[PDB]
Amino acid sequence: GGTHIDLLFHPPRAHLLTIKETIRKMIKEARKVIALVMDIFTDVDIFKEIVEASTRGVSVYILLDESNFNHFLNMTEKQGCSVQRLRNIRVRTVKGQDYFHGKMEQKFLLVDCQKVMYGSYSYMWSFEKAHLSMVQIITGQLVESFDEEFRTLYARSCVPSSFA
Amino acid sequence: GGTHIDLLFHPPRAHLLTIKETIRKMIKEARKVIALVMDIFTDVDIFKEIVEASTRGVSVYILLDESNFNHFLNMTEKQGCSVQRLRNIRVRTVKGQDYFHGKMEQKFLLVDCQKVMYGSYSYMWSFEKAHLSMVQIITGQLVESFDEEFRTLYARSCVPSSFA
Ligand SMILES: Cn1cccc(O)c1=S
């Protein structure tokens, strides 16, 4: 078993779906587990897809950069969909070394220990509308290294200050 | 011919060199061409390695996000090493769609059409000291898709406003 990689771009180049559509498709097709690591998460469409996955029974684990976590909290509040009262969703924060806030500069989506989207696309309106970005769709052997990185980050994450 | 990928982390996990050391090694070993795409470039050690490569005869092509290009210009000025008077270095800027500045959110180093470093590490002090990040070292088939992306970005780049 090797590794297979396809590239996707925003704007699209030689593929039928946008990166956002592919994100939503990956989440819709999740059967078991979603493991998300994200610097900034304010995209309501992606959030809805994840909430809906969790209501299907999919376990969702989200790790967010601590310094931008308030933007995600703001968005969940706006949607009237507190992540604290969703039984299948765990959210924790990760930070780097301070001096000036050190950050978790990492973005990937890992679905059912089977498929990874890894790249520069952040889950924000600006990446759908404004920014140029790229991602890899990864399957095969290298997916295991993403699982191991997710676990490592998860081990160094904190319960967000808000949550009691 | 397939594709081979190794992961490197900052801080390091199960490898001997830091990402910055690996960047400097890749640049030192460049024989022909360096193609760099970078959101923010203020790291003086990496800049010196690139200037030195260019004095060796290596062709250097750098594409920077337009909105942060001033930070690179500031750094080159501080170092007394204007990129305009270096014959083997071309620098152009890339932007996304405005509304609020659209950005080129892309980071990769492509050396001698042979090896790529692709990941979340930006060429800034903060990524050496403060941030958590990861990259892939890519060789083989997938390198060709990076060459093609570099050319595509290069085709949509502009001469920076400063340069006459
Ligand atoms: C997070 N990430 C991953 C790969 C490439 C990137 O530029 C970034 S920001």
UniProtKB/Swiss-Prot annotation, chains A, B:
Highest taxon above the source species: Eukaryota
Where, per UniProt, does this protein localize? Cytoplasm; Membrane
> Which modifications occur after translation, per UniProt?
Phosphorylated in vitro by CSNK1A1.
Briefly state the protein's biological role.
Probable proto-oncogene that functions in the epidermal growth factor receptor/EGFR signaling pathway. Activates both the EGFR itself and downstream RAS/MAPK and PI3K/AKT/TOR signaling cascades.
Similarity annotation: Belongs to the FAM83 family.
Q: How does it assemble?
A: Interacts with EGFR; positively regulates EGFR inducing its autophosphorylation in absence of stimulation by EGF. Interacts with RAF1; displaces 14-3-3 proteins from RAF1 and activates RAF1 within the RAS/MAPK signaling cascade. Interacts with AKT1, PIK3CA and PIK3R1; activates the PI3K/AKT signaling cascade. Directly interacts (via DUF1669) with casein kinase isoforms CSNK1A1, CSNK1A1L, CSNK1D and CSNK1E.
What note about domains is in the entry? All members of the FAM83 family of proteins share a conserved N-terminal DUF1669 (domain of unknown function 1669) domain of about 300 amino acids. This domain mediates the interaction with casein kinase 1 (CK1) isoforms. Therefore, it has been proposed to rename DUF1669 the polypeptide anchor of CK1 domain.
Name of the molecule in the record: Protein FAM83B
The part of the entire sequence present here spans 117 to 287 of 1011
